[PDB]
Antibody, heavy 120, light 110 residues
Framework: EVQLQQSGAELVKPGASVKLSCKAS????????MHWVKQRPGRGLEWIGR????????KYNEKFKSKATLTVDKPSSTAYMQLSSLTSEDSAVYYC?????????????WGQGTTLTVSS | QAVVTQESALTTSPGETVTLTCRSS?????????ANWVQEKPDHLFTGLIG???NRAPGVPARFSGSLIGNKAALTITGAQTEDEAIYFC?????????FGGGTKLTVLG
């Protein structure tokens, strides 16, 4: 069974950084892109970027180039997203979602999301 | 960047065939955008439905289908069920970057 297991909710002060995780199981990790998505009420879904776990090549929404850092660790089948220089605009639910490298273009499995709140 | 727009809300009745659409500020949505659709059910449970305009993900009910209708991408639900009440997001590719529409809340009354 495919699972994407995300990390626990975070509550941090403005200016801090956080690292969220998404552990994949039940499939060949390196055969699927990992996408990261920001959900804030009133703003639908916002794409952050994607990473190719075979080599860690990234593509970002230019809005997040100076905010997010995507990495993977292949041996532990885990994708990470660091968010830097945090502000209240960063408060949101964040998701990881896989997409096959080999020419299907649907999402299928999503993580359950991690809440980030940036306050005081 | 491109702005991808969806109906904010649609109401249907059980058993109806309903179509949700996805437009782009750039002009026509084409197969080169590889439109995809995702469903968010209550408790933030996301499932992929459609990719590459018209390809249904394995295990998705066959009543969901994707197409282009005019200059928009479209998700058709053929025989709406109670459990299809959800938010549906579309997303379009431009230069290897994904842009989500704002989502459509589908209410199924009954």
């Amino acid at each position: 069974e495919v699972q994407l297991q995300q990390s626990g909710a975070e509550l941090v002060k403005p200016g801090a950084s956080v690292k969220l995780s998404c552990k994949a199981s039940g499939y060949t990790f390196t055969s699927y892109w990992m996408h990261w998505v920001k959900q804030r009420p009133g703003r639908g879904l916002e794409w952050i970027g994607r990473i190719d776990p075979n080599g860690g090549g990234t593509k970002y929404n230019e809005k997040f180039k100076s905010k997010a850092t995507l990495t993977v660790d292949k041996p532990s089948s885990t994708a990470y997203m660091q968010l830097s220089s945090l502000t209240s605009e960063d408060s949101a639910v964040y998701y990881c979602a896989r997409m096959w490298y080999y020419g299907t273009y649907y999402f299928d499995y999503w993580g359950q999301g991690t809440t980030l709140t940036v306050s005081s | 960047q491109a702005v991808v727009t969806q109906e904010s809300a649609l109401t249907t009745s059980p058993g109806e065939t309903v179509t949700l659409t996805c437009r782009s500020s750039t002009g026509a949505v084409t197969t080169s955008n590889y439109a995809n659709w995702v469903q968010e059910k209550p408790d933030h449970l996301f499932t992929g439905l459609i990719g590459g305009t018209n390809n249904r993900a394995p295990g998705v009910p066959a009543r969901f289908s994707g197409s282009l209708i005019g200059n928009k991408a479209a998700l058709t639900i053929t025989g709406a069920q109670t459990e299809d009440e959800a938010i549906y997001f579309c997303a379009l590719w431009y230069s290897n970057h994904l842009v989500f529409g704002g989502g459509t809340k589908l209410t199924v009354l009954g």
